[PDB]
Amino acid sequence: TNILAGAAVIKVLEAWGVDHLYGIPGGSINSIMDALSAERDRIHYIQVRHEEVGAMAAAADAKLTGKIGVCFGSAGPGGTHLMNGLYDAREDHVPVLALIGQFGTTGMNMDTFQEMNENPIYADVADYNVTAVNAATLPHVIDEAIRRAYAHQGVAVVQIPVDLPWQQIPAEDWYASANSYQTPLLPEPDVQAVTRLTQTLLAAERPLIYYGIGARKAGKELEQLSKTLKIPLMSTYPAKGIVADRYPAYLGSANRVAQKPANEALAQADVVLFVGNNYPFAEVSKAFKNTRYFLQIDIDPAKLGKRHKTDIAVLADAQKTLAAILAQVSERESTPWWQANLANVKNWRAYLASLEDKQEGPLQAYQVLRAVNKIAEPDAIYSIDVGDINLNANRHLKLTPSNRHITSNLFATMGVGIPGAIAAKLNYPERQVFNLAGDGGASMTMQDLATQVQYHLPVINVVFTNCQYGFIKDEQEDTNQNDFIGVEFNDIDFSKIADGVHMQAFRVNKIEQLPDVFEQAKAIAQHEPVLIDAVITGDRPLPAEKLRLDSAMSSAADIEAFKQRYEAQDLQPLSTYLKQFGLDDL
Amino acid sequence: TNILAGAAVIKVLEAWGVDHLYGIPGGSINSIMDALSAERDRIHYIQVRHEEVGAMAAAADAKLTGKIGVCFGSAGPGGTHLMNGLYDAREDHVPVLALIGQFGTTGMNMDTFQEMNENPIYADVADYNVTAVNAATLPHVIDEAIRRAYAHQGVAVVQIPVDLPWQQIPAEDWYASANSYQTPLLPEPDVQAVTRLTQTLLAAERPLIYYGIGARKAGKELEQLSKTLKIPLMSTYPAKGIVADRYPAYLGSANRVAQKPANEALAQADVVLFVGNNYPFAEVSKAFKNTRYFLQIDIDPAKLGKRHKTDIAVLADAQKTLAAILAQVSERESTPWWQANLANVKNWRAYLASLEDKQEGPLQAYQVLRAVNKIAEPDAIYSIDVGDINLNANRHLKLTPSNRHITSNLFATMGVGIPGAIAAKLNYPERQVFNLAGDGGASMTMQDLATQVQYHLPVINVVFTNCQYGFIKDEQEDTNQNDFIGVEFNDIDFSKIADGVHMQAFRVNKIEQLPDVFEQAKAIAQHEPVLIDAVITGDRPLPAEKLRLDSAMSSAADIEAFKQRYEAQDLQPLSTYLKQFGLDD
Amino acid sequence: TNILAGAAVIKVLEAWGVDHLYGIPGGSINSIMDALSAERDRIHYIQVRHEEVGAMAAAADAKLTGKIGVCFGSAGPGGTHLMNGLYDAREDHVPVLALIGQFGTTGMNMDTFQEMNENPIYADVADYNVTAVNAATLPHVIDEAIRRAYAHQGVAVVQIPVDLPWQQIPAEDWYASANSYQTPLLPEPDVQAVTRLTQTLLAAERPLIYYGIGARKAGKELEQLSKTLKIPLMSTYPAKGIVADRYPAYLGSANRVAQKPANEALAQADVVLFVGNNYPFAEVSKAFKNTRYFLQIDIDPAKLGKRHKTDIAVLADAQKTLAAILAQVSERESTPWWQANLANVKNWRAYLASLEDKQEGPLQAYQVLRAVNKIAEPDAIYSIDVGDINLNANRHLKLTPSNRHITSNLFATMGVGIPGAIAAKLNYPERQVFNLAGDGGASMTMQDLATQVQYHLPVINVVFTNCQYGFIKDEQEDTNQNDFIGVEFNDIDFSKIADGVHMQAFRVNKIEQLPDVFEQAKAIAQHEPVLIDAVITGDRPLPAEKLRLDSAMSSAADIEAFKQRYEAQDLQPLSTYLKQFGLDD
Numbered sequence A: 001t002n003i004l005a006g007a008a009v010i011k012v013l014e015a016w017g018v019d020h021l022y023g024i025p026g027g028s029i030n031s032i033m034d035a036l037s038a039e040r041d042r043i044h045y046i047q048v049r050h051e052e053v054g055a056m057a058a059a060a061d062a063k064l065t066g067k068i069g070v071c072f073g074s075a076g077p078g079g080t081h082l083m084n085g086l087y088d089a090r091e092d093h094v095p096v097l098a099l100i101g102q103f104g105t106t107g108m109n110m111d112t113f114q115e116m117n118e119n120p121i122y123a124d125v126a127d128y129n130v131t132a133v134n135a136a137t138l139p140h141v142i143d144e145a146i147r148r149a150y151a152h153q154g155v156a157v158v159q160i161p162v163d164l165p166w167q168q169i170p171a172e173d174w175y176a177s178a179n180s181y182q183t184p185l186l187p188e189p190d191v192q193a194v195t196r197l198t199q200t201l202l203a204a205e206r207p208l209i210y211y212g213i214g215a216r217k218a219g220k221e222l223e224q225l226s227k228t229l230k231i232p233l234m235s236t237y238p239a240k241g242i243v244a245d246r247y248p249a250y251l252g253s254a255n256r257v258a259q260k261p262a263n264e265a266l267a268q269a270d271v272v273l274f275v276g277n278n279y280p281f282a283e284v285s286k287a288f289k290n291t292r293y294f295l296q297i298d299i300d301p302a303k304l305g306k307r308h309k310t311d312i313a314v315l316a317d318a319q320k321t322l323a324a325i326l327a328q329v330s331e332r333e334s335t336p337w338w339q340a341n342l343a344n345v346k347n348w349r350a351y352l353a354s355l356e357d358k359q360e361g362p363l364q365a366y367q368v369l370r371a372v373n374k375i376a377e378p379d380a381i382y383s384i385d386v387g388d389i390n391l392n393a394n395r396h397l398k399l400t401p402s403n404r405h406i407t408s409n410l411f412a413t414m415g416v417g418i419p420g421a422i423a424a425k426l427n428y429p430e431r432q433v434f435n436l437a438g439d440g441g442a443s444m445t446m447q448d449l450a451t452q453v454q455y456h457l458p459v460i461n462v463v464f465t466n467c468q469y470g471f472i473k474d475e476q477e478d479t480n481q482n483d484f485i486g487v488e489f490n491d492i493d494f495s496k497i498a499d500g501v502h503m504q505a506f507r508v509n510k511i512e513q514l515p516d517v518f519e520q521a522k523a524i525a526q527h528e529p530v531l532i533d534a535v536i537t538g539d540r541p542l543p544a545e546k547l548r549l550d551s552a553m554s555s556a557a558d559i560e561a562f563k564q565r566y567e568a569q570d571l572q573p574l575s576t577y578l579k580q581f582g583l584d585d586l
Numbered sequence B, C: 001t002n003i004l005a006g007a008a009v010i011k012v013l014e015a016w017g018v019d020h021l022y023g024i025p026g027g028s029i030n031s032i033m034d035a036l037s038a039e040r041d042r043i044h045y046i047q048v049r050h051e052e053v054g055a056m057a058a059a060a061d062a063k064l065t066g067k068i069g070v071c072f073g074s075a076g077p078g079g080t081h082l083m084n085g086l087y088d089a090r091e092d093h094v095p096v097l098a099l100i101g102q103f104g105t106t107g108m109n110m111d112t113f114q115e116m117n118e119n120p121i122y123a124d125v126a127d128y129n130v131t132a133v134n135a136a137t138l139p140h141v142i143d144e145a146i147r148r149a150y151a152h153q154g155v156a157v158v159q160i161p162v163d164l165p166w167q168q169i170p171a172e173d174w175y176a177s178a179n180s181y182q183t184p185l186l187p188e189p190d191v192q193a194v195t196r197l198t199q200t201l202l203a204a205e206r207p208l209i210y211y212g213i214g215a216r217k218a219g220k221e222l223e224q225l226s227k228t229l230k231i232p233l234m235s236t237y238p239a240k241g242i243v244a245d246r247y248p249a250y251l252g253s254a255n256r257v258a259q260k261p262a263n264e265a266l267a268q269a270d271v272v273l274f275v276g277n278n279y280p281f282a283e284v285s286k287a288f289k290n291t292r293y294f295l296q297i298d299i300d301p302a303k304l305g306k307r308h309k310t311d312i313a314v315l316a317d318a319q320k321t322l323a324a325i326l327a328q329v330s331e332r333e334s335t336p337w338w339q340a341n342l343a344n345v346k347n348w349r350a351y352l353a354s355l356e357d358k359q360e361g362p363l364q365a366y367q368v369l370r371a372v373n374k375i376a377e378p379d380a381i382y383s384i385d386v387g388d389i390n391l392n393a394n395r396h397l398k399l400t401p402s403n404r405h406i407t408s409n410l411f412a413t414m415g416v417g418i419p420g421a422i423a424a425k426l427n428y429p430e431r432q433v434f435n436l437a438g439d440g441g442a443s444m445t446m447q448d449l450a451t452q453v454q455y456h457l458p459v460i461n462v463v464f465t466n467c468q469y470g471f472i473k474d475e476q477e478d479t480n481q482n483d484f485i486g487v488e489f490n491d492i493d494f495s496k497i498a499d500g501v502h503m504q505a506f507r508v509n510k511i512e513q514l515p516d517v518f519e520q521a522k523a524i525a526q527h528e529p530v531l532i533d534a535v536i537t538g539d540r541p542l543p544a545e546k547l548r549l550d551s552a553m554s555s556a557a558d559i560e561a562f563k564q565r566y567e568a569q570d571l572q573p574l575s576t577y578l579k580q581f582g583l584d585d
């Protein structure tokens, strides 16, 4: 007939199906720790080495499974360390609960040790942000935070004065509303609007279907629409793998973490079907500047007409809408536009294969990723950090609907590779998990390699050591007038870092070393984490947003220099293929 | 070809169908003003006398029509004056766009005159809160603000450096996304959840259906479910009028702005169907402590199981779900529970009528509200302020589906009567509009009586002058150890205030004066605003949350005292009627 | 032995010497109310009619006396209504304590009625901003709030869950730290910096001393430095009256709420001594573009070199430093610069007198202010609203060191006239108090005329009724392309508003009516408030920032037009006087 409030809080977490949660203890959160300790057989605390990793891992949990991620930080600095993961959750719109320690209510507002008003710290990041002041309502406040975080797809933060969880409350009054949870209703496509949309799409001279992760349930429909109608596909970077990369009319993504065929085609398209997509570069890059008709399908009214003016907007679930389109169309014959794009994709893929297929000499990112592909299981999960790896993984990983990949899509916090892989292995112990990270990003969260060791999480860590912030060096090349600054730095030997945390590891710097090292890693990771430190060149990846290949656009000198720098002697501009099939370049 | 960015902003407002907007000019917003000035045929600027009235009116526009309300304030104090209306919009979850003036970009962050970082001011109230820094993107920012305010049912705030609207931008780049706006088509209510909910409701001995304004489209279904199944109805106060008040099994609302039958029945119910309802008193009042099964229908996942542990919570539209229940049920004969509740309602209504039907003597709020009922058109709109008037209007107004009534439901800001009535008349110039306000709340926004005059808005204003913050006086009676403080104050003659703003007006203090003054006001308000200042007694209205009528519950002395104070000699407790029909309390 | 925590809170206020505090009660603050109710002999609660007036009055208390002002608001809308006064206190850097009601701790975070997280609301305005969560520490939190508000010269806000003040706490634990309060003893002004500053000032050909209210203790030194050295004086508008306006070398203020001689001389000066001054127009107006050497004296390191590149900036007290200058200088003979400025002032004052001295015809603001001067006591206090009244009062009031005047200096919130006058009369019941307000600003806070009546505060209210936001109309004339909008509106008869709150009042519209109405008002205000509603013309006051008088600068046609519009035929540009005394412009 009494229960400690902290025990009730843990029971609320259990009712909501939380399996694991992350943080670092402190006096200010030791009463939650005490309750966790008693519940260790039913809910699983993961002690991280820096609280940002806990927050990042919580966000990654939710990205992966759709289940609210849970993290905590002790008062003051524990909680402020969560921020990069909390902002990742906000911007990637995934549910996360963050608990923040606080001084007991008898010492709050006394200016005592590490005691401050913590509520304003979290006001900007959080959907729901409260300091608890009563023990008997604390289960409700946690319940409320969870329910809001789910409903609103974002972060709920509760600051908990440490006395409250040690107070007895009536056993029979508290409850969880987990039993009542439901996911949002999937609205239906208006029949006449879909018919009009379909007519406009079919009348297009140079159509494209351009989807994001809002279409993640619709890969079959996307590929069949493409095949039936002879309409190429392109996607946001995060939507890579929804349709298998091998599909010959998959163009890739646009902008910079991009593939050449997608940029080139988008510039020529007259009609775009923009589906489940909130591409953030739309306006700033003038992506749709010459698009004649723009057709949008999205579940969120806040998105309709956001990125360009729509000619037809459908507020509906992507898969229901795409299914409705598919059900009212029949097979169309080939067109010049279709064949031009198919030929362009083959040329591009041959380029990427030529980089991958080198067998000896100085190691580049491209062969490292080929070596990843060669040991990758069909349902592998990839946690990808932030930098050139997004660009290179987007081009080289061979994904299918069976895979998952995650990064910090929009906040783009470096350091997520390690935490996302921790989360992935916890959620999918029987699936192969990679952490693909640059040296700058791996550096930021390197201590939590120890967490993979501690919890025996068999992640395959691959660090891309260029001794640079390469992504930023290339930006300075593009914009800055004075010499590079802050973008070239000393080596860190991550094989030695791994040794220090008691993780098996390898360092390689030559292409010919890859096959055996990756086989060894593949086998180690049947039981324990492993790290490969790939010492790679400073070669810049081909900039798909700065092509110098079309005689009509670029000087001979510039073309020659581009081909030489990027080993791109066999790449053709899309206009070559347009011209073969009798179309103008526009 | 170029367009001024401010002109494009006004065209974005026009594209979204904004009819009218409110504010007070200042140097820091004079470039938006300049754009408005060229567009008087197409959008109608309402100059208020205090910016809070503009914000409150913008919220009221959206409460009434479902279409975004728009207001503005000049840099610094113009914008901070919006707050009570912006918080009203946030808490009543209605879409409002607020534009805030700011110093030009060349002087921002110089600590110049009335120049501050304005963004933090609005961070808490606003769903979307940005300072614009570019002219070419300004139309998009306004469009984005509107689209989010709608999507998220709340407040969007844009701080606009005054230079930007005077800059030329390319004419053919900007657009509005109003053309994309639509409402979702939903699947069928979840068949197997609704079927199991229905069985639990029908198996109950003492069922109630307890709805809020999320059931605003479901009045017909509510009443027919009630009649067919013999299940009494109760509502949130704001949900008054969704089912006509005359319906004999409408119990009213619970808690304090409440009616006796609803409080009494809720304490007895074994099963409650909670539909379209976010009653904020649920937990603090232990409203459902006795309830065996708690069933919910709501459109918002964030609400499912929120207010009480819920046995079945259906995520669906209220009307559609109630219609799907009604399609799977059929007539039940009258039950003792049904008859007891019917009898209890009849007794309560006789009490209220006895108060209304006095013909002479010192004026009370009760007769004033009878006089409003006797001049009210069937489709009248009521803008109601905050205080005893919520309590009294909830009991006495005779509403039907044809009426609307609005107040500040959850933020409960006083002063909302005047601005809500302004908004109602602007939206519905052919409908009768009342502002029902206590003296305290009318005082707070009294200067905007001049706005009704200036714009020839024929509101019937009724001020309830008790020379008190009566609602708070009664609270102090209940809780405070020491003498009343801050709750009794000196008279203001609102007939004289009205004369000062050039509005026709009357002051009355006797019951027998009401008929001819209200007839005159009804006639004046065919063409011009009017005010009636009703000088009322300090009598405390019956506290439905503090009943002393049941001799099983309360001492004879307490009952005697209650009956005396509240003129309640003929009220019977619900237990009398339960017993009459063979039920235990 | 125990004490209620609320009683201890009131004793903390008493320990700090708080005489009076303002607010409106509500359930969410009724436990503080209960404590106040037991302490009426020792602290005086002023029930206002809108919480913004309480916040504005609290700020005004501190502006006037230097002692913390105290206000409160009920949860949600009571507290948000404080904002315009709290931002006034922040921007005018005066100490204010604001108490905000909150739901009891047992219902916080339940989404109950008018319950929200209130802490983010006040985060931007407040130096200190906390929600109390314990009764035993509540006295300390209030003490801490006060001590910080003083130390940091700004606003401290405490949100108080209503249960805490009704809890018993140990009687002998709590304390106040008022007994520790004191002011610092400072070293000598830096000797070698002051000596080098002095040489630079004296070497100038066209020096000016330009002071703000940081020189409030230095009026004697300012005037004697000016007279001895033959250096004209100019000030910020708020610094009017530190040196008597009659002083022949007082030029006035610069920019718009300005006087012609100050703008003209500043543009010519080679050396400016900027003392106790944070003039917010410095950079945006390029005030010092022509100045060769810029010298500063200020008490705040944050100000040193802030407004212009500074040759010598002395961190010191203004009075002490000006006295140390005066002790190291001696008489200089009259210079051409001195004589030119003297002549320019004489010509300007003759212009203002010509406006004041009209005896009959349509009433203008100028004669109203003459009529105020002719009933004003030598130690009168003026609470001034925001608009043309700042401009006109700055030109026409004849102040001395014995007067005080206050407005919202930097936030510039309209509506401050009424509350500032309430605060002035509460602090100084034996001193004559005026509220000088435009119709727009008086409208915003008109209901609190009833507070003057209720508390028998004999303010002389003078409303300048032009049926415009005149200050903004003139801005639109200057900047806007399209027609005036939002700046001309329908009359309010403030004599009738006054009658409605039971205040004696007059309305005048002709110059010849002024003497007998102002005499009557002077006499009424020996015992009761009074209001004069002065119906004034729409004439634009001379724009000192837009002078068209110098034929080297302006066309003959522009000069002719300026002279006609502003009745300025006899004004001469400063260059005339510079030439007369042998100086180039």
Ligand SMILES: Cc1cc2nc3c(=O)[nH]c(=O)nc-3n(C[C@H](O)[C@H](O)[C@H](O)COP(=O)(O)OP(=O)(O)OC[C@H]3O[C@@H](n4cnc5c(N)ncnc54)[C@H](O)[C@@H]3O)c2cc1C
Pocket (backbone or CB within 6 Å): A092, A211, A212, A213, A214, A215, A235, A236, A237, A238, A239, A253, A254, A255, A256, A257, A258, A275, A276, A277, A278, A279, A280, A297, A298, A299, A300, A303, A316, A317, A318, A319, A386, A387, A390, A407, A408, A409, A410, A412
């Ligand atoms: C270093 C770095 C660089 C990057 N640069 C690029 C780049 O050059 N190119 C690129 O493409 N990306 C890039 N990104 C990612 C980019 O920032 C955006 O996150 C991404 O383009 C947006 O993808 P999205 O629209 O699929 O996802 P989101 O932004 O999450 O949008 C999903 C959309 O789907 C809608 N939706 C959700 N569910 C449904 C449903 N059931 N039915 C219909 N609609 C639904 C949503 O409402 C929303 O509009 C980069 C990332 C990193 C880390």
Ligand SMILES: Cc1cc2nc3c(=O)[nH]c(=O)nc-3n(C[C@H](O)[C@H](O)[C@H](O)COP(=O)(O)OP(=O)(O)OC[C@H]3O[C@@H](n4cnc5c(N)ncnc54)[C@H](O)[C@@H]3O)c2cc1C
Pocket (backbone or CB within 6 Å): B092, B211, B212, B213, B214, B215, B235, B236, B237, B238, B239, B253, B254, B255, B256, B257, B258, B275, B276, B277, B278, B279, B280, B297, B298, B299, B300, B303, B316, B317, B318, B319, B386, B387, B390, B407, B408, B409, B410, B412, C113
């Ligand atoms: C001075 C004062 C005192 C008051 N005291 C009382 C009192 O004693 N008693 C009282 O009853 N009220 C009182 N109120 C009002 C009270 O604060 C709450 O605002 C009110 O009880 C909540 O009403 P609601 O649930 O209808 O509205 P809301 O709080 O707006 O909730 C609407 C609900 O409907 C759901 N919904 C919306 N659309 C749909 C749909 N299509 N289908 C299904 N669900 C939908 C929403 O998700 C939400 O849960 C008072 C007001 C004032 C001014």
Ligand SMILES: Cc1cc2nc3c(=O)[nH]c(=O)nc-3n(C[C@H](O)[C@H](O)[C@H](O)COP(=O)(O)OP(=O)(O)OC[C@H]3O[C@@H](n4cnc5c(N)ncnc54)[C@H](O)[C@@H]3O)c2cc1C
Pocket (backbone or CB within 6 Å): B113, C092, C211, C212, C213, C214, C215, C235, C236, C237, C238, C239, C253, C254, C255, C256, C257, C258, C275, C276, C277, C278, C279, C280, C297, C298, C299, C300, C303, C316, C317, C318, C319, C386, C387, C390, C407, C408, C409, C410, C412
């Ligand atoms: C509608 C309106 C229009 C206005 N327009 C004008 C205008 O055109 N012209 C104008 O002049 N004003 C105008 N003002 C006022 C203006 O906004 C500023 O408030 C004013 O110019 C600044 O005055 P200040 O420097 O005296 O005061 P503050 O800004 O308060 O600065 C006081 C300075 O003194 C220093 N200080 C304090 N104590 C001491 C000490 N003991 N010793 C030394 N230094 C000390 C401080 O550190 C600070 O730097 C207007 C006001 C309104 C309401």
Ligand SMILES: Cc1ncc(C[n+]2csc(CCOP(=O)(O)OP(=O)(O)O)c2C)c(N)n1
Pocket (backbone or CB within 6 Å): A385, A386, A387, A388, A389, A411, A412, A413, A414, A437, A438, A439, A440, A441, A442, A464, A466, A468, A469, A470, A471, A472
């Ligand atoms: C925490 C953080 N700081 C800075 C950035 C900006 N940033 C984006 S990519 C990048 C460089 C990443 O370097 P590295 O991980 O070494 O990858 P590379 O591009 O060299 O492969 C930087 C600094 C960021 N996104 N996150």
Ligand SMILES: Cc1ncc(C[n+]2csc(CCOP(=O)(O)OP(=O)(O)O)c2C)c(N)n1
Pocket (backbone or CB within 6 Å): B385, B386, B387, B388, B389, B412, B413, B414, B437, B438, B439, B440, B441, B442, B464, B466, B468, B469, B470, B471, B472, C024, C025, C026, C027, C074, C077, C078, C081
């Ligand atoms: C702006 C604001 N301040 C304070 C309150 C608290 N409050 C709720 S009702 C009330 C009294 C209302 O008085 P009045 O308008 O005279 O109505 P009465 O109850 O006397 O009829 C007060 C002060 C509030 N809701 N809004």
Ligand SMILES: Cc1ncc(C[n+]2csc(CCOP(=O)(O)OP(=O)(O)O)c2C)c(N)n1
Pocket (backbone or CB within 6 Å): B024, B025, B026, B027, B074, B077, B078, B081, C385, C386, C387, C388, C389, C412, C413, C414, C437, C438, C439, C440, C441, C442, C464, C466, C468, C469, C470, C471, C472
């Ligand atoms: C609350 C508030 N809203 C807007 C402004 C902008 N403002 C500065 S002066 C002014 C006009 C004042 O009009 P009035 O009080 O009638 O004085 P007048 O200039 O007509 O004498 C306005 C609207 C402000 N300072 N405060």
Ligand SMILES: [Mg+2]
Pocket (backbone or CB within 6 Å): A438, A439, A440, A464, A465, A466, A467, A468, A469, A470
């Ligand atoms: Mg690197």
Ligand SMILES: [Mg+2]
Pocket (backbone or CB within 6 Å): B438, B439, B440, B464, B465, B466, B467, B468, B469, B470
């Ligand atoms: Mg009242």
Ligand SMILES: [Mg+2]
Pocket (backbone or CB within 6 Å): C438, C439, C440, C464, C465, C466, C467, C468, C469, C470
């Ligand atoms: Mg005016």
